[PDB]
Design an enzyme around this catalytic site. Structure first.
Site, PDB file in Angstrom:
ATOM      1  N   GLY A  28       0.799  -1.202   0.019  1.00 34.52           N
ATOM      2  CA  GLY A  28      -0.151   0.104   0.041  1.00 34.52           C
ATOM      3  C   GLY A  28       1.004   1.264  -0.080  1.00 34.52           C
ATOM      4  N   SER A  29       0.093   2.245  -0.306  1.00 37.35           N
ATOM      5  CA  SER A  29       1.008   3.794  -0.135  1.00 37.35           C
ATOM      6  C   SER A  29      -0.124   4.659   0.194  1.00 37.35           C
ATOM      7  CB  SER A  29       0.983   4.108  -1.947  1.00 37.35           C
ATOM      8  OG  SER A  29       1.744   3.214  -2.604  1.00 37.35           O
ATOM      9  N   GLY A  30       0.718   5.890   0.574  1.00 31.72           N
ATOM     10  CA  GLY A  30      -0.131   7.179   1.212  1.00 31.72           C
ATOM     11  C   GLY A  30       0.669   8.219   0.947  1.00 31.72           C
ATOM     12  N   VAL A  35       4.857   1.219   1.290  1.00 31.59           N
ATOM     13  CA  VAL A  35       5.376  -0.134   1.798  1.00 31.59           C
ATOM     14  C   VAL A  35       5.244  -1.257   0.825  1.00 31.59           C
ATOM     15  CG1 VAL A  35       4.644  -1.805   3.602  1.00 31.59           C
ATOM     16  CG2 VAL A  35       4.464   0.789   3.945  1.00 31.59           C
ATOM     17  N   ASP A 165       3.098   3.781  14.915  1.00 31.16           N
ATOM     18  CA  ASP A 165       2.721   5.446  15.423  1.00 31.16           C
ATOM     19  C   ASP A 165       2.397   6.076  14.541  1.00 31.16           C
ATOM     20  OD1 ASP A 165       3.499   6.074  18.417  1.00 31.16           O
ATOM     21  OD2 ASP A 165       4.793   3.972  17.965  1.00 31.16           O
TER      22      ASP A 165
HETATM   23  C1  LIG Z   1       1.929  -4.940   5.640  1.00 37.42           C
HETATM   24  O1  LIG Z   1       2.406  -5.478   6.762  1.00 37.42           O
HETATM   25  C2  LIG Z   1       3.173  -4.593   7.431  1.00 37.42           C
HETATM   26  N1  LIG Z   1       3.655  -4.979   8.560  1.00 37.42           N
HETATM   27  C3  LIG Z   1       4.288  -4.076   9.561  1.00 37.42           C
HETATM   28  C4  LIG Z   1       4.389  -2.650   9.098  1.00 37.42           C
HETATM   29  C5  LIG Z   1       3.533  -2.303   7.852  1.00 37.42           C
HETATM   30  C6  LIG Z   1       3.457  -0.786   7.653  1.00 37.42           C
HETATM   31  C7  LIG Z   1       4.328   0.199   7.846  1.00 37.42           C
HETATM   32  C8  LIG Z   1       5.631   0.256   8.268  1.00 37.42           C
HETATM   33  C9  LIG Z   1       5.936   1.048   9.141  1.00 37.42           C
HETATM   34  C10 LIG Z   1       7.600   1.094   9.645  1.00 37.42           C
HETATM   35  C11 LIG Z   1       8.387   0.337   9.012  1.00 37.42           C
HETATM   36  F1  LIG Z   1       9.648  -0.036   9.248  1.00 37.42           F
HETATM   37  C12 LIG Z   1       7.973  -0.741   7.702  1.00 37.42           C
HETATM   38  C13 LIG Z   1       6.713  -0.477   7.561  1.00 37.42           C
HETATM   39  N2  LIG Z   1       3.708   1.322   7.433  1.00 37.42           N
HETATM   40  C14 LIG Z   1       2.259   1.046   7.294  1.00 37.42           C
HETATM   41  N3  LIG Z   1       2.117  -0.237   7.377  1.00 37.42           N
HETATM   42  C15 LIG Z   1       1.024  -0.894   6.888  1.00 37.42           C
HETATM   43  C16 LIG Z   1       0.600  -0.877   5.523  1.00 37.42           C
HETATM   44  C17 LIG Z   1      -0.733  -1.482   5.176  1.00 37.42           C
HETATM   45  C18 LIG Z   1      -1.856  -0.924   6.091  1.00 37.42           C
HETATM   46  O2  LIG Z   1      -3.008  -1.630   5.994  1.00 37.42           O
HETATM   47  C19 LIG Z   1      -1.508  -0.939   7.647  1.00 37.42           C
HETATM   48  C20 LIG Z   1      -0.189  -0.450   7.855  1.00 37.42           C
HETATM   49  N4  LIG Z   1       3.016  -3.055   7.361  1.00 37.42           N
END
Ligand SMILES: COc1nccc(-c2c(-c3ccc(F)cc3)ncn2[C@H]2CC[C@H](O)CC2)n1
Ligand SMILES: Fc1ccc(-c2n[nH]cc2-c2ccncc2)cc1
Length: 339
Positions: A28-30, A35, A165
């Site tokens: 996903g993106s924002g 990510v 966070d």
């Molecule tokens: C997709 O699996 C996953 N696992 C851990 C963090 C993240 C992440 C992170 C993320 C944050 C910090 C990092 F070091 C790596 C990833 N930011 C957003 N996400 C998810 C993206 C999909 C959304 O539905 C929920 C937030 N994503």
């Protein structure tokens, strides 16, 4: 000693990462980043890699980038997203313009869980317990999350939960009423209000306060918890906020046992303690963990607090190049956690 990087374009975005990370797949993106899921050949772990978007676009983006990296480097707790790795393809400060953050792959968020039918009381206990355990830790570092909502709660197939966070439906649905009234002195219990909203939703399968805007949001909240009593009205300095609140038809506090009838009476008691209008009277994360509702999970010897967290940078007004240089220093000083 620099790893070999390789580049690839995924959904309009270019990813330049170390060879250790293979099989990148967009998740996903924002506005703040995108990510990818990947496989880390060094550890054998599935990871999520976040590439920050335009990290140094402005003083605001640059400070945000530093803030995120500092926060992530500090968070070391089982229910809070932390860092496995952080890297940049840049070979020096001068050409530094991309930051990549790596954490354990979780794969789903809490919204995906509540969407896919309703949960058992045991699942609600476990999930909320984990949120509170993570919040206790975050709060002890003098950090306020401020935007807790289902989409910011990562959950894996084992129902293990981690608080994110940041922060790549509506945030306002989970926001404390004092924030809707734009109070500038809100406290850590704004997060407890959000946990209350999330718990209600897990128990009933419906958004508790689905406001269409800030005014509607406040109206929905007051209809359940009642309009403010004398003790709370006295704490409101804003004349417009008071004219608005006090010009509303007065409403009593509803009987929570009736509104959430069918739910575990212990869950209802906890909800009542979290969804208190006056933030000064709302239960804290530490107190909530000791609530009878979590008797099968609570262990005071395993609900740790955080090391002191220096946020003095928050009061600083620096140049983009200064925030960039500090971020760069933080990328280079990163020591990964033990495998
Ligand atoms: C997709 O699996 C996953 N696992 C851990 C963090 C993240 C992440 C992170 C993320 C944050 C910090 C990092 F070091 C790596 C990833 N930011 C957003 N996400 C998810 C993206 C999909 C959304 O539905 C929920 C937030 N994503
Ligand atoms: F209608 C409401 C809803 C929430 C509040 C509130 N709860 N805790 C603190 C406040 C508050 C709101 C505005 N100004 C000071 C304090 C006050 C009135």
């Amino acid at each position: 000693e620099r790893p070999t990087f390789y580049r690839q374009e995924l959904n309009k975005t270019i990813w330049e990462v170390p060879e250790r990370y293979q099989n990148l797949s967009p998740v996903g993106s924002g506005a703040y980043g995108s990510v990818c899921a990947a496989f880390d050949t060094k550890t054998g772990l599935r990871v999520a890699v976040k590439k920050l978007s335009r990290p140094f676009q402005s003083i605001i983006h640059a400070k945000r980038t530093y803030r995120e990296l500092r926060l992530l480097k500090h968070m070391k707790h089982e229910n809070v997203i932390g860092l496995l790795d952080v890297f940049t393809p840049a070979r020096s400060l001068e050409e530094f313009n991309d930051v990549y953050l790596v954490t354990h792959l979780m794969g789903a968020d809490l919204n995906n869980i509540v969407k896919c039918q309703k949960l058992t009381d045991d699942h609600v206990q476990f999930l909320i317990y984990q949120i509170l355990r993570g919040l206790k830790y975050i709060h002890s570092a003098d950090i306020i999350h401020r935007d807790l909502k289902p989409s910011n709660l990562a959950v894996n197939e084992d129902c293990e939960l981690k608080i994110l966070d940041f922060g790549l439906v509506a945030t306002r649905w989970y926001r404390a009423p004092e924030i809707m009234l734009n109070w500038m002195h809100y406290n850590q219990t704004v997060d407890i209000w959000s946990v209350g909203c999330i718990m209600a939703e897990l128990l009933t399968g419906r958004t508790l306060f689905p406001g269409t805007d800030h005014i509607d949001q406040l109206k929905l909240i007051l209809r359940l918890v009642g309009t403010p009593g004398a003790e709370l009205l006295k704490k409101i300095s804003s004349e417009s906020a008071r004219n608005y609140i006090q010009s509303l038809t007065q409403m009593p506090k509803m009987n929570f046992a009736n509104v959430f009838i069918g739910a575990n009476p212990l869950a209802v008691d906890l909800l009542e303690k979290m969804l208190v209008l006056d933030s000064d009277k709302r239960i804290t994360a530490a107190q909530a963990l000791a609530h009878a509702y979590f008797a099968q999970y609570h262990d005071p010897d395993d609900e740790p607090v955080a090391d002191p967290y220096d946020q003095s940078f928050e009061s600083r007004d620096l140049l983009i190049d200064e925030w960039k240089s500090l971020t760069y220093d933080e990328v280079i000083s990163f020591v990964p956690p033990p495998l």
